[PDB]
């Protein structure tokens, strides 16, 4: 999922 994936977490600080 997003929050455990570096590129995704960094691009979605609002969610993660």
């Amino acid at each position: 999922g997003c929050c455990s994936l570096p590129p995704c977490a960094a691009n979605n600080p609002d969610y993660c």
Side-chain angles (χ1 to χ4, degrees):
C2 188
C3 311
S4 57
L5 191 66
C8 196
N11 287 319
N12 297 283
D14 51 329
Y15 177 65
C16 295

